[PDB]
Design a protein. Structure first.
Ligand SMILES: *Cc1c(COP(=O)(O)O)cnc(C)c1O
Ligand SMILES: *Cc1c(COP(=O)(O)O)cnc(C)c1O
Lengths: 277, 277
């Protein structure tokens, strides 16, 4: 298909990544994932705003405006005739002889974006998935959606090896987030999720879900909970652009309540549906 | 010049990295740097051993034996006619459709290696350098020499704009290591340095210096010290393959003792010098 390369759309075949691209030697870059429903991009403005925020946090200056970035994305979707799936795009500090410190400002960031056809996770959304607890060994700037993802890779692999969908991470016995999703817990009709600080990535789906809770008049409390408290929640689920609202019905052999998707998770899934294009 | 690409030596111009190389999307890989003195590789066996160990730690199976890998490096050095400088080589898990979990064991790792002529930093070895303290925000597996170097990148850049050579990192005031070097402190003829656990990379230069210390009968205590205690040291220096034994005479405007390279630091450099080709 076609790939967004810097400021132009070209056939995948024309893209050339240098061995000294800082994204390849230091994971020095940021990224975003946007879901596309039947040709329509979901919350694209919010994801673009976060790409710029992430880049700002590590001092990368994206060579062009958000408006232009949005236009390039539209083109990318049209040229690939993407129906339902997602757009992946990243920005690295650029190509320069290997050195940890920033290169001369005359070095242009490298932008890469492409699409992938991917249906909504129907089965998971209806039946829920299994998860496992994994100690959070990530760096202390999880608020940045960066390419330094080795911690997430090791966590997800451990989960997959155990036949689990996601790994629920914990730092000092406190549940932070999944390897690539935010975690929510419901207890006595109240929604709980770890607050948005450097310990987690402030997900767009996470913000949408919180808005949905307010819409159905459900109390929301952003205070963290421990692994012990998590196993005692009435309901539990994770969120991400591609997982939407996926119920977690069991963790390491221990069923969450009765092992079925709860009524509040269902109500939130219904409210979320009204938001989809 | 020529670049080592997998098991072939090709002209730099021919090397192409795929946008879905996991080293480019996750920093999913490991690397090593070997110094070359007058055409000879210094401690190459130790570096090859660590490359395989780092790789094993994140379950990447390098497809060639160490003897084969050693042969390729020798080949790479000859072809580029490298006299004095270093060899950089890394291995990533390979190219596969973007997914956090591991690809099925059929995807081969991507190996890249190249050279760079670069003289010994004689001026730094003789006059010493300035450093600055920076909170250690790195992930918890610093014992792996991986491509997830965004922490080191931000630290080094903060040091660079302060006119400093290296950033000495610390977790809750306990000194761990520099952004890309190990830190040693000397107090009353005794050598101090953080022990080798998951908080630091166990440097090969660090280990050679410790060997040098035993050879000149200088006591060594591998126990960590604080940023406050570091400032009260008689001597301080950092080590790395490219920095060798580089004295730190000043930290954040505060001289180490008198701001001059110490007697023991000189003795260690003298013993070290007997080790290089
Ligand atoms: C991207 C990401 C999420 C989810 O954010 P969304 O905008 O909802 O996709 C959650 N956790 C981590 C660690 C992430 O990187
Ligand atoms: C590579 C590295 C060092 C130094 O190790 P050497 O083998 O002596 O070069 C020190 N610290 C970090 C964080 C490193 O990655």
């Amino acid at each position: 298909g076609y790939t967004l390369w810097n400021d132009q759309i070209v056939k995948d075949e024309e893209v050339k990544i240098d061995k000294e691209d800082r994204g390849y030697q230091f994971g020095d870059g940021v990224y975003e994932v946007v879901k596309v429903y039947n040709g329509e991009m979901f919350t694209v403005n919010e994801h673009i705003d976060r790409l710029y925020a992430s880049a700002e946090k590590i001092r990368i200056t994206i060579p062009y405006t958000k408006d232009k970035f949005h236009q390039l994305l539209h083109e990318l979707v049209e040229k690939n005739e993407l129906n339902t799936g997602h757009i992946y795009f990243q920005v690295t500090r650029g190509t320069s002889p290997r050195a940890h410190q920033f290169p001369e400002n005359t070095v242009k960031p490298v932008i890469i974006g492409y699409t992938k056809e991917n249906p909504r996770p129907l089965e998971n959304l209806e039946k829920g998935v299994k998860a496992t607890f994994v100690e959070d060994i990530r760096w202390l700037r999880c608020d940045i959606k960066s390419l330094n993802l080795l911690g997430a890779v090791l966590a997800k692999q451990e989960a997959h090896e155990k036949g689990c969908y996601e790994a629920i991470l914990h730092r000092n016995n406190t549940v932070t987030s999944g390897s690539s999703s935010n975690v929510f817990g419901i207890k006595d009709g109240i929604l709980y999720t770890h607050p948005a600080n450097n310990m987690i990535l402030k997900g767009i789906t996470r913000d949408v879900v919180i808005a949905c809770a307010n819409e159905i008049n459900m109390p929301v409390k952003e205070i963290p909970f421990t692994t012990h408290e998590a196993l005692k929640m009435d309901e539990l689920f994770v969120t991400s652009t591609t997982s939407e609202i996926t119920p977690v019905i069991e963790i390491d052999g221990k069923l969450i309540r009765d092992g079925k998707v709860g009524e509040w998770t269902r109500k939130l899934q219904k409210q979320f549906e009204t938001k989809i294009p």
